[PDB]
Design a binder for this molecule. Structure first.
Ligand code: PDY
Length: 283
């Protein structure tokens, strides 16, 4: 721990402060001080995460439990998708690069999901990019590990009070990010839980028992919810092509059981001509 020299503060998450740091191995790392001894379950869960290694998952290099505090040492990347989106706002991310990033994030999700590990908190600031065209998921497994946060990417079954949600929650979040790369605007930018739900309802239709069996018995479902009609995706994500719109529609299925899995999404015709472009990055 005295083994690291802070370089600068680079971020601030739900789980504490993040610094760029140098390991006195020579390596440059992202160091996360976990907000706080450490409960023993958090330890064994995080220890499990160190083994969950994939090219599209930010590598957990080390887990330092000392002085009764917890530090997570991560592989360092120089940019995130939020900043890249803000920088690309004038002409948009080119479609082939959108498709490459979506494809790679679905590979990362299919990996974690096959081990029954969920992210739960996907958002642009958690997706990190390098000069080689790679994109990686940061903070995977941390929500389960530890128990204004953005609601924009939160799945409707969470907002409706489901306690035992599934890997489908990460697919919803990724479809929301896909729509945002395409249109250069957040799809559902809610500033309260009801505003988030009602934005979803205004675009996708108020869900009912027809499209989502069991919806009306959910913990926070209210029969008094206004009933809005569903919009056409051609209005929601222009100028995305029909393969893209078709894939997005399956990622945004109301019923978590009908929503497409990461593994099935990888086979969708949208990915038939996928390539790996390199972005233009100013670091
Ligand atoms: C171009 C300046 O922007 C940057 C600069 C550095 C980063 N790097 C970074 C940042 C900012 C980061 N921040 C965390 C903050 C809390 C939520 N999850 C991500 N985590 C990691 C892990 C590996 N790299 N990294 C991201 C964006």
């Amino acid at each position: 721990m005295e083994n690291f020299q802070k370089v600068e503060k680079i971020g601030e998450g739900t789980y504490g402060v993040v610094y760029k740091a140098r390991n006195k191995t020579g390596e440059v790392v992202a160091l996360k001080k976990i907000r706080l001894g450490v409960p023993s379950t958090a330890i064994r869960e995080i220890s499990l995460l160190k083994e969950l290694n994939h090219p599209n998952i930010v590598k957990l290099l080390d887990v330092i439990h000392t002085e009764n505090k917890l530090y997570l040492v991560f592989e360092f990347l120089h940019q995130d998708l939020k900043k890249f989106m803000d920088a690309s706002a004038l002409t948009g991310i080119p479609l082939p690069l959108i498709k490459s990033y979506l494809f790679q994030l679905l590979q990362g999700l299919a990996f974690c999901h096959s081990h029954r590990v969920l992210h739960r908190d996907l958002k642009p600031q958690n997706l990190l990019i390098n000069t080689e065209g790679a994109i990686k998921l940061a903070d995977f497994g941390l929500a389960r590990a530890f128990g204004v946060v953005t609601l924009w990417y939160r799945a409707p079954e969470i907002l409706l009070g489901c306690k035992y949600y599934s890997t489908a929650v990460d697919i919803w979040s990724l479809g929301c990010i896909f729509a945002e790369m395409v249109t250069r605007r957040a799809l559902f930018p809610g500033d309260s839980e009801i505003d988030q739900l009602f934005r979803i309802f205004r675009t996708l239709g108020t869900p009912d028992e027809v499209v989502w069996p069991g919806v009306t018995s959910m913990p926070d479902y209210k029969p008094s919810f206004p009933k809005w009609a569903r919009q056409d995706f051609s209005k929601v994500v222009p100028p995305l092509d029909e393969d893209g719109r078709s894939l997005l529609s399956q990622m945004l299925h109301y019923d978590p059981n009908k929503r497409i899995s990461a593994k099935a999404a990888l086979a969708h015709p949208f990915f038939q001509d996928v390539t790996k472009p390199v972005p233009h990055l100013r670091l």
